[PDB]
Amino acid sequence: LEVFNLATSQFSKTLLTASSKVFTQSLYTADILSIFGEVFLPHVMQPVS
Amino acid sequence: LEVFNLATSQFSKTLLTASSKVFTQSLYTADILSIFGEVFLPHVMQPVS
Amino acid sequence: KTLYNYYSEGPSTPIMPHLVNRLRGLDALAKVDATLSKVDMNAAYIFALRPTFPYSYGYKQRFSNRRLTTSALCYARTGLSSFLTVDKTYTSNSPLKGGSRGWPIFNVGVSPHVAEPHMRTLSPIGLEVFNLATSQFSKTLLTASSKVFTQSLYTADILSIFGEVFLPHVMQPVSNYTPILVRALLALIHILGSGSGNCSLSSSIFESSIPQFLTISHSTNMSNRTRYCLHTWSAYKDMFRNGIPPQSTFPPTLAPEGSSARILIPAALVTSPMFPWLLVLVSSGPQFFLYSKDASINTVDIGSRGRITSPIPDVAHLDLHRLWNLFRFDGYRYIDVVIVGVDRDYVWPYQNGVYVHGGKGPKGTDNYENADVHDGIGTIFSSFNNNVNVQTSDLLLGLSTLWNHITTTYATEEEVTMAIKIAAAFALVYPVQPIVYSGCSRALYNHTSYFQPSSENCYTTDTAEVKSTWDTVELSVQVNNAMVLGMTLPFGQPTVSSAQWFNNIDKAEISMFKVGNLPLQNLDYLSLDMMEFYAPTTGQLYDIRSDSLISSAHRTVNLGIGYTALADFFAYLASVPAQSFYHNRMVTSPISKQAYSVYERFIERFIDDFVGWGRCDLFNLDTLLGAKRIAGVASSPIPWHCSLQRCPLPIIMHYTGLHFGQEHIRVRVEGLQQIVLRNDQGSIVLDALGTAAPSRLAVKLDWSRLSAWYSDTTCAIPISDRVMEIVNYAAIWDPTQERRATGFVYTYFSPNFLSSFNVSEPIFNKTINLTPPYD
Amino acid sequence: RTRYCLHTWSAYKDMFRNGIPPQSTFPPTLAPEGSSARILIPAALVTSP
Amino acid sequence: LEVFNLATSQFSKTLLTASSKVFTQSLYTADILSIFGEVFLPHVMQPVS
Amino acid sequence: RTRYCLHTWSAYKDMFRNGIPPQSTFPPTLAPEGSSARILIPAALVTSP
Amino acid sequence: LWNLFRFDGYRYIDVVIVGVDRDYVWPYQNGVYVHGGKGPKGTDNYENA
């Protein structure tokens, strides 16, 4: 949802709502957000499977 | 229909996501609509035969 | 409305409200009449930049008995699509077949007027910068900035940049992108080539299609170059610490100034292919010259009967200039490129040997301490280097990306429309107008000052088929100079500047008089949009559904031909003679200045009513009145009776609604006059019947009288003998002339040029049948 | 006769800049010989008579 | 009119933005109204001819 | 006679402190010779007769 | 009658051209070099006023 917000809105921040750095090497850091916004943008726009 | 919905969607076009690649890489980039939606974009905007 | 509606209206009462409602409708038609995104790219370019204008011809005869005529279709086109000169390396002084010794330079200056900005909306980062500007610090004011993303545009440093060098725009967020859009449209049109496919003064030499490959040539003596200085943000900000140095670009810009400007470009966007095309289109131009890679495979020669000769005889020593070379734009003379978000080891990705101030230095060092100035866009951007060969698609990729991004993100539809309307004034280049002369009958030999038939500026080069008897021009040096000096833009303005690259010497003579002016692009808007300081105008990714590059260029060329046609119509209504636009327009007759005075009123009224831009930037009399009659070249003995008319009649009819159908030809009670002349020995010498030509007021009150006037004074032009049917039956009787009798003038096009009208598309290689249908 | 070239999809898209072959290929009717037309056929349909 | 609106606007005059330059650099600074609005400031406050 | 000096805008503003030439130049009517008046003309208008 | 009248006006006037390069050339009388324009020797950015 926050990746979608980054895709559809100009950056603020208030948009960083779910990501955290508490857990090391998890799937919830900012790097994973970058991965999602880079190589999975259409699925972010239209989530299907 | 998925490709049409993607191409007619509203983006923020910031450097965080891949929606900016249409500007930073080239007009003809596959990073949002896949190579197929990009190759067939004009034909799915106006489907005729 | 539709094209069917407009073809059945005709001119009406006041003709200025007419011809502008028609133009707006025709422009609206061109927006939707063809989806060019579903065809091949070359086909799209052909269909956009070279429109066809179909029409049906035909003539009647007095006594027809089993006469067989073909009612076919023809497709009229106007304008030069490129220019053919002698090779830069060519030492002989012999005249080449179809190759001009030089070429015109349409030098455009800088408009003092400012493109009016319109309101924008702040981004959240910009909103917080605004809060910092208008409120005492708290904090609670830091609402959008973050340090999660490294080297992004959302840290506190970018806030400092905005509050330092863009404060007025923070206070009043506005932008206008019309001038860069104008330059982009012109770049596309001049690189590809708009018009009819004619590519020479010879009127019979055509280029088959868009070139596939281009060649870049540099010329120090002939280019119009901009100086560039590359800095990182830290190095650029550090040179203003100890006072203000000379030529400071630091202060913000509301009204752009031609000398010196700064652009702040994020590091992510420097590698975009649009970036060099961004540096071009705001700089001076041309900084390099563009040629078709080889002129043999594209150029053809067309016969009088439509015989295509593919390899023109002397193509080995000819250069095929693009229209890009015939134009000269004044932009910014000095640009400070400031890359934002880079370290002290930053490397210029383009041309080697180029070091960014504050970046990687020559040997191996960081924080380069020199701010080197590079003269010309070619000294950086190796893709613009001398003798570079490039596919046109690769060249245009950056332009298309730039246009798409700007028109979907930064600019509004109004800005794009204004850019189209302005660019249409410089979209096309036309050769000097050729005219013929019927002459006078033998019976009137003693009552005329112009007895013999004649012609002017009628040049052809094909030798395969029969040459037209009216095409008597031979291309000497002085005649070539005169013909180049007679070339015009859509609104009629010529040039008095020209260039020549002969032997091994390149030389340009640039007059202080300019054919027009263009506004500068405020680069602060560009910087702030590229740093996401504004909210985007739209969230769409593609302009295919709205205001694409090729659709915009098609609209621009459509409006440019419309400007040419309406200008010809105005010159007719203002009785502006064709000879007032020749190389010797100043030394021939005092009619020229009066005609300019009358014509400029029509032009300015139209420009204010339709374009809305300040007239003087699009048309003025500076180049007309600064004529340059060169050495000799005597004008042919033709009376000044035909108007300006750069377009064929069917195109003028399309844009004006003028109807010249066969129903206006009389075939069958007394409105004629018996005209009598006597000599000293009381002897009647004329005793002839005559009819009065209509006054322009009568035409104003009844536009069908102009149609009748066409059908009473027009004859089909013969090809092999200089005797028309008309001169055996009719003549012009002007009582206020010392000698009352003259013939007819008839702006001339050429059978070779008219053969190209026989196919729906400007493609002629070998399988095209240009022969007249059914003989 | 007509001239034919056979490509795999991977090889065909790898002969264009950044991949991504052109979107439209229909030529002007007056010049069908000017360019090269293309046909995209899935491997399943190739074996069909 | 833009220059007039700028010069009649309300600022906080803190050291973070350029509105403080009228105090830290000189009374006649171009950093807010450009060199042109600064040169023509008295004449746009009272436009007459 | 009158004495004339010709400057470009860049050169003219670079002969004053921190750039920024003076805002007003109209002299007292009793002393028109005391100072130097200036005229700012765009490059487009210079070529006008 | 032009010769019979004598007018008093400005004695020193600065003419500032706005929007020209450092190689600007005075289109009127030859041998006249604009401050910051083309110099006598063919050099740009003429230093003398």
Author numbering:
A (entry chain A), B (entry chain B), E (entry chain B): 197 to 245
C (entry chain A): 71 to 738, 743 to 849
D (entry chain B), F (entry chain B): 295 to 343
G (entry chain B): 393 to 441
Provide text from the study:
The first high-resolution capsid structure of two GLV subtypes was determined using cryogenic electron microscopy (cryo-EM) single-particle analysis at a resolution of 2.1 Å and 2.6 Å for GLV-HP and GLV-CAT, respectively. As confirmed in our observations, the GLV-HP particles tend to aggregate with each other both within giardia parasite cells and in purified samples, whereas the GLV-CAT particles do not exhibit this behavior. Additionally, chronic infection of GLV-HP hampers parasite growth more markedly than GLV-CAT, indicating that GLV-HP might have features of a pre-lytic virus. However, only the CP-B to CP-A direction is identified in the GLV-HP capsid. This C-terminal interlocking includes three possible hydrogen bonds: Arg671–Asp922, Arg675–Asp928, and Lys774–Asp927 in CP-B to CP-A in GLV-HP. However, apparent structural differences are observed between GLV-HP and GLV-CAT CP-A/CP-B dimers. The major structural difference of CP-A is the aforementioned absence of C-terminal extension in GLV-HP, while that of CP-B is a variable loop that consists of Pro316–Ser330 residues, localizing between the interface of CP-B and that of CP-A. Notably, Phe320 in GLV-HP forms intrasubunit interactions with Val184, Leu590, and Asn592 in the CP-B; however, in GLV-CAT, the corresponding Leu320 in CP-B interacts with Asn112 and Gln282 residues in the adjacent CP-A. The GLV-HP particles interact with each other, which causes particle aggregation and affects the preferable intracellular localization. Nano differential scanning fluorimetry (nanoDSF) thermographs differences in Ti (inflection temperature) values between GLV-HP and GLV-CAT particles, which may reflect their capsid stability in multiple dissociation or unfolding steps. It is also another possibility that a lack of intersubunit interactions, which are mediated by the variable loops within the GLV-HP capsid, might instead allow intersubunit interactions between two virions. The comparative analysis of the two GLV prototypes reveals significant conformational differences in the C-terminal extension and the variable loop, which are critical for CP–CP interactions. It is hypothesized that the loose assembly of the CPs in GLV-HP could expose hydrophobic CP–CP interfaces to facilitate particle–particle interactions.
